């Protein structure tokens, strides 16, 4: 156990992201398009897979 | 089609072309980086390779299985008489690189250094630097204007030095002359050091000291024209091979329709200039001293010269550098010993080394004895001894 607030603060940077389906890039959670050129700024995004 | 089995490339492409060196004295392509805080000192030295021997020392490596245990190692000996400073030169820096602008010589030049400026010394009027010494013996007029010119300009100061070949058992009589960089103080302090040290000798312990990692620059031993099997280490062809088997079978494909530069071929082997780095100094010996070969544990008064002398070289009556391992070049060759270009910690470059015993048996055979007193004590009296 870390602490509940400290787990929230660490998960803000480590777990509450989104993943581009084409190029696996770690993206902002409210993003609409990937920031990478190689996937062509696609809008195929998924949430980052949580535990539990 | 593709090669059926992978294998590493034979030989090193960075040591190309494998041609004869331009001179018998290898060039120092780089000097240690200067900083203007240390006192004025040379960056390198010249000596003559004499030969190899063994030592026994107690190894100090905290963690090795041979910690605090005796090991026997091969060292090589470089005979180093004190070098004579004749001349300095300054280099300005241009957008096309470094460029010398003046050279100021010493006044009295010895015969062994002024033999370098001749191909037929025995039939000559010996007129060399005569009008230059006539430029000297005024008060200062044609001299410190060039010296103040080197002070005003010339971001790099190098000193022209020459060996004392007559102090060695070599039969050459013609000294070797070289430029050695100074790496201390300002430009004015460098040229003041050079001006004070004109016509003077510099000893090897003024530049080197024990447990120092240095570089050896020398031209390797020559071997003439050599086939590809020993020149490059390629695999010998099988026994039933028509038209010979010390060859390379395929020297290239159909396309590109040329022999490539990367294909191993026959030619000159050896006599290339090489720079070998990271050699530790074990002993800076003094020639004005008996018991050079003695240590604190052996303590028998014997010089570093073996029984019967060094094979093909002779005696070590001058100062010497005992350095660990093998250096390029054969015996009787000029070799330039250079300070390290970087600071190496490594827990091996910082090891303090104290020798226990130095081998002085004969290298002209299976020598049994270190000293003639020991040989006489073991064998008793002979017929020739009455």
């Amino acid at each position: 156990i870390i602490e509940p607030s400290l787990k929230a603060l660490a998960s803000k940077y480590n777990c509450d992201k989104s993943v581009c389906r084409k190029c696996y890039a770690r993206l902002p959670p409210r993003a609409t398009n990937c920031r990478k050129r190689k996937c062509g700024h696609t809008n195929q995004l998924r949430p980052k897979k949580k535990l539990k | 089609s593709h090669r059926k089995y992978e294998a590493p490339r034979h030989g090193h492409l960075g040591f190309l072309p494998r041609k004869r060196a331009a001179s018998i004295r290898a060039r120092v392509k780089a000097f240690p980086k200067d900083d203007r805080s240390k006192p004025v000192a040379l960056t390198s030295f010249l000596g003559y390779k004499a030969g190899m021997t063994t030592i026994v020392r107690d190894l100090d490596r905290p963690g090795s299985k041979f910690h605090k245990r005796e090991v026997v190692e091969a060292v090589t000996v470089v005979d180093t008489p004190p070098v004579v400073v004749v001349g300095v030169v300054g280099y300005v820096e241009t957008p096309r690189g470094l460029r010398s602008l003046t050279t100021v010589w010493a006044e009295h030049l010895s015969d062994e250094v002024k033999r370098r400026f001749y191909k037929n010394w025995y039939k000559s009027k010996k007129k060399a630097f005569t009008k230059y010494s006539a430029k000297y013996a005024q008060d200062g007029a044609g001299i410190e204007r060039e010296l103040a010119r080197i002070k005003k300009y010339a971001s790099v100061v190098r000193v022209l030095v020459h060996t004392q070949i007559r102090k060695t058992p070599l039969a050459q009589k013609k000294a070797h002359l070289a430029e050695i960089q100074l790496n201390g103080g300002s430009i004015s302090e460098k040229v003041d050091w050079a001006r004070e040290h004109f016509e003077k000798t510099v000893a090897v312990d003024s530049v080197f000291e024990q447990n120092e990692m240095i570089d050896a620059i020398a031209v390797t031993k020559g071997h003439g024209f050599e086939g590809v099997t020993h020149r490059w280490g390629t695999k010998k062809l099988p026994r039933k091979t028509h038209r010979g088997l010390r060859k390379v079978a395929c020297i290239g494909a159909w396309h590109p329709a040329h022999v490539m530069w990367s294909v191993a071929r026959a030619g000159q082997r050896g006599y290339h200039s090489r720079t070998s780095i990271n050699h530790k100094i074990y002993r800076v010996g003094k020639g004005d001293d008996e018991a050079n070969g003695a240590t604190s544990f052996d303590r028998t008064k014997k010089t570093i010269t073996p029984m019967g002398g060094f094979v093909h070289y002779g005696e070590i009556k001058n100062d010497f550098i005992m350095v660990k391992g093998c250096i390029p070049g054969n015996r009787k060759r000029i070799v330039t010993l250079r300070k390290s270009l970087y600071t190496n910690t490594s827990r091996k470059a910082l090891e303090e080394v104290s020798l226990k015993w130095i081998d002085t048996a004969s290298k002209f055979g299976k020598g049994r004895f270190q000293t003639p007193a020991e040989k006489h004590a073991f064998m008793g009296t002979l017929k020739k001894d009455l």
Binding site: - | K65, F66, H67, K68, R69
Partner: protein, 225 residues
């Protein structure tokens, strides 16, 4: 205690260490836990010497030790001999042995009073053992095992022998040594018990894989409680 210890992963402590009543010897290339076991259990009363015998980390199989004396092979250097002479107390005698079998821990199984040796040792070496150690000597094999030092662990209180040993050999050796002997295993069933562990009057040190019934057999036969 039979103390669980490893030599950097090795569960054979008798190979890398030699323990007597008066002194202890440990290899120079040892871990902090391995040194800390002997330092904590032995205390400051008994000297622990970090030593190398004949340039080898193995010291228990190279040397045979007693409270009165220590025996070292011929290949032991003068620096190691002088270091042992300085580090050891004045009571013990250190003497080089010039003998072909040359691995004295394997050859000799000994305690304070009585010793078992390899049958084929030389008579000068037997007299040297009887002189330096002050110990009466028998030439015997443990059920056909000539390496009595490797295949027996011996102390004053009792002894552990090889597991595959004939019972008749057990009472014969017990009557010959005047101590009770138990056939047993050490280090999860390893046969080499003397190489497996070291023991003295109040301490036994064994490998970590030595199981609880084996450790109980050790403390029972050596009376360490």
């Amino acid at each position: 205690m039979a103390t669980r210890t490893q030599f950097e992963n090795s569960n054979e402590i008798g190979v890398f260490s030699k323990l007597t009543n008066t002194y202890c010897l440990v290899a120079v290339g040892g871990s902090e836990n391995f040194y800390s076991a002997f330092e904590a259990e032995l205390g400051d009363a008994i000297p622990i010497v970090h030593t190398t015998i004949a340039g080898t980390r193995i010291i228990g199989r190279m040397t045979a030790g007693n409270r009165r004396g220590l025996l070292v092979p011929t290949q032991t250097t003068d620096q190691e001999l002088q270091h042992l002479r300085n580090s050891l107390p004045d009571s013990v005698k250190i003497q080089r042995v010039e003998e072909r079998l040359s691995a004295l821990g394997n050859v000799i199984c000994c305690n304070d009073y009585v010793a078992l040796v390899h049958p084929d040792i030389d008579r000068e070496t037997e007299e040297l053992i009887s002189d330096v150690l002050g110990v009466e000597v028998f030439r015997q094999t443990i059920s056909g095992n000539i390496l009595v030092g490797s295949y027996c662990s011996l102390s004053n209180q009792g002894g552990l022998v090889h597991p595959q040993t004939s019972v008749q050999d057990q009472e014969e050796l017990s009557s010959l040594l005047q101590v009770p002997l138990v056939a047993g295993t050490v280090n999860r069933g390893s046969s080499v018990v003397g190489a497996g562990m070291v023991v003295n009057d109040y301490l036994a040190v064994t490998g970590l894989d030595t199981t609880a019934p084996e450790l109980s057999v050790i403390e029972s036969i050596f009376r360490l409680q």
